Design a protein around this ligand. Structure first.
Ligand code: C8E
Ligand code: C8E
Ligand code: KDO
Ligand code: CA
Lengths: 342, 342, 342
């Protein structure tokens, strides 16, 4: 909600409380999943061709006892917008791959999980320097592009050390990526994104998915008109898709597709399919499905501040030694949520 | 404070800073106790018979150094209010037992401690689904009731596992409870509450207080008029009252009583007595006092945003092997507080 | 930003996002340093001669992954201001030494580091009771003083225990200090501060800097007019200046000096020099430099809500066994920051 707007400076303080429960045979997923987010988006007019901005978003789990706290920063960045010349921001932000893969990340609860956070340039991550340009310098309506750099986020100590070190599955070396999207008209959009990240020496000491670079190549399509939403994304990755908590897939092929309809009375059913196919895994595993499910659900929007939903992950992965070793869930989940937001 | 009210959506952002110091021979209590809370309460009008809401409240200790952070979520829930048909909410909230025991939880600093947080359905806890009805459907003025369910919050791994696992003393199985309060008129109120929670297998592997279910039965009475506040609550529990950090009392009898007066110039003296009597404790302990103190104090309210208080916990427990083993404090405490709130 | 002002109560909710990167051969400093702060400052008019207030400020690092959270309370206090009779506040706050040493803590990124946080009464710390008077009771314009007490913040357990125990380098015993500053006119200011804190037995079990009390003596001078800022502070300490993470200096002499100029178009160059000279260190180290650098940098202010800066720490310490043992950084750092604030 915009809570301040005075003398060229505006501040939106926003958030949500999601009273959320999962039902699953997977005891690591089953039970209370209540959480909240809080954030702000601020903007300051500097002059005719320059606006400054800042955004922060934080998640605090609501499903723990008072003896602990599970919270984290989703984004935290500052930037400048310069008219038709583009914008630049730096901080914790979304990787440019998500400029296209976000088109399928629209499910009531699940979805968006052929990749994760702190996962090279695929989604949220630290130290992104991001240049963006909408409508190609004001010359081509509907043609947008981005160019992005990510500095190394290494280990806590030793050869890969940076100030902000972390575990191998959340590290990266220096990376570069970009995206292009185009409005084809009549509700249709097409997009592509590429990223290439150096990997660190400690990442390459894990058994799975060695290589000098983590690479991703994405294409996407969407239709968004007449109360219909359709989208698909295909992403091919190299040493970039996590294999549970074991390392990465030498290669993976990720595909997500979704269809939704918004009824005027407030109901938005959703059907989707997601898969991630890993190739050439070490330890004799070879080709393995890393993710495979159908998702059926619906959100009922009471208004823009209140909603409720059901989401059903129909998990098509087989329970096998591989999935158990990797810690990949093979069970179905039903989610029920009630959401207040501002 | 209400900081937003527009187009049927309202947001109250509230908080407090309590500059607080304890004086005690108990070194685990003595010293700086400064803390803050922050929260919001949002409400959205959906239609003539339906309002959505969300509430979140967080505590951050202000008495640590910058190398650590001690914070936690008090509540986090979302709900719907259906005019006279009642309300429903889900998330981290107060157990319905507290609908009655809260009547004595009014001391300047101490009190409210014959039970704790994450303590079956007695106070704050995860995964409450709560139905409430005020003035009995608009048929009986002053008659309120609630019915509540709490899903299992289990262990981090193994047989009792849920996604949001925690230590035994803060676990629960599936539970159900209810409360009824009635305005007798002329300032008097009467209330009762009952709860019954399944206990988990890991809870039942501790030495103290094994059983299938944790159950509570509460009666309360109060007078709240003419600047006088008098209240008492009596609660009988089974396998539900913590014995320090060792487990639970097979049975306990808890009693709290308080008298206060509000002077028009701002001063509110308070006198109270609390005890918790544990029965049939294991390891030869038998009947033991778990809590026993007189409390004398006063709050001076400068206005609705600023107050200061003294509170004196006169601890009547004897220092003995049992209390030392259980980690129950037997020393007096004096608290001095200065509170800004909004 | 002031977001509420009604019926005698006002609330300023403020914060910043600093998109920040360090370049250094010191891998513990190098890399992404993005962070945010959030805070509030509230004030309530009680009557003609009394105002209540509260302030809280929190830092949340923006340079970690989502599997961790690094955050802390900077300040959290409540107070009363009694017209010209002065103010009193209690909580986590700044020690009165900083009333003078803050005059040099004005660099774009670095600076302010001949002392740290939770470092006796030198900067931020727990449990400060602080009396302040501006303009000497309304009788002497520009003459300010303060008197401050800090209660013991001891160990987690054992002989020095307090409720809010911490590691030795962040402990203190009971302390007293004061400051006096005077506006000489025409941009000139002069100040002095003195503090004396009991040390704890666990502090005195460390090798470096044992003694009954930690003591500090500070003088400062500044010139602040005609777009020029000049300041210097000299502090002599006894058992109060940290030697890396090893303990304290039996004696230290700290000197900071800074010169800045503000151009109308928004650029503020800055040049500074800082040194901390430790004396009589144990383990044969004798006299050692603890800190020594020249700082050159500049901030460009777009407006009151947006800025960017470069800061260059030219480290003059030698890499030698002492600095490596103490964990004192001897490398240069360049910082680049982009800051949105409200
Ligand atoms: C109105 C015609 C504009 C076409 C722009 C196409 C841009 C393609 O760039 C990437 C290939
Ligand atoms: C194995 C290759 C599959 C083809 C993916 C290309 C998808 C491009 O979508 C439009 C951009
Ligand atoms: O606070 C005290 O009474 C004392 C207890 C001792 O064990 C020790 O902590 C001592 C401090 O070292 C004095 O600062 O204080
Ligand atoms: Ca490979």
């Amino acid at each position: 909600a915009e809570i301040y707007n005075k003398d060229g400076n505006k501040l939106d303080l926003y958030g949500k409380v999601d009273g959320l429960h999962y039902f699953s045979d997977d005891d690591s997923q089953d039970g209370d999943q209540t959480y909240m987010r809080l954030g702000f988006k601020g903007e300051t007019q500097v002059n005719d061709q320059l606006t400054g901005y800042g955004q922060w978003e934080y998640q605090i789990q609501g499903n723990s006892g008072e003896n602990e706290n599970n919270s984290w920063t989703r984004v935290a960045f500052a930037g400048l917008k310069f008219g038709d010349a583009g914008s630049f921001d730096y901080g914790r932000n979304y990787g440019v791959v998500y400029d296209v893969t976000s088109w399928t990340d629209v499910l009531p609860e699940f979805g968006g999980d052929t990749y994760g956070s702190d996962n090279f340039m695929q989604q949220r991550g630290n130290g992104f320097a991001t240049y963006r340009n909408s409508d190609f310098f004001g010359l081509v309506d509907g043609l947008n592009f981005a160019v992005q750099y990510q500095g190394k986020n290494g280990s806590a100590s030793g050869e890969d050390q940076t100030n902000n070190g972390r575990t191998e599955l959340r590290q990266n070396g220096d990376g570069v990526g970009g995206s292009i999207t185009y409005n084809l008209g009549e509700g249709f959009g097409i997009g592509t994104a590429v990223s290439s990240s150096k990997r660190t020496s400690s990442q390459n000491d894990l058994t799975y998915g060695n290589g000098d670079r983590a690479e991703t190549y994405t294409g996407g399509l969407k239709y968004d008109a007449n109360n219909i939403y359709l989208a698909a994304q295909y992403t091919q990755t190299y040493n970039a898709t996590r294999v549970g908590n074991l390392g990465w897939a030498n290669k993976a092929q990720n595909f997500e597709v979704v269809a939704q309809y918004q009824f005027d009375f407030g109901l938005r059913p959703s059907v989707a399919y997601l898969q991630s196919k890993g190739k050439d895994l070490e330890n004799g595993y070879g080709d393995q499905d890393l993710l495979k499910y159908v998702d059926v659900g619906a959100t009922y929007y009471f208004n823009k501040n209140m909603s409720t939903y059901v989401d059903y992950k129909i998990n098509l992965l087989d329970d096998k030694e591989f999935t158990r070793n990797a810690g990949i869930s093979t069970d179905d989940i039903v989610a029920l949520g009630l959401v207040y937001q501002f």
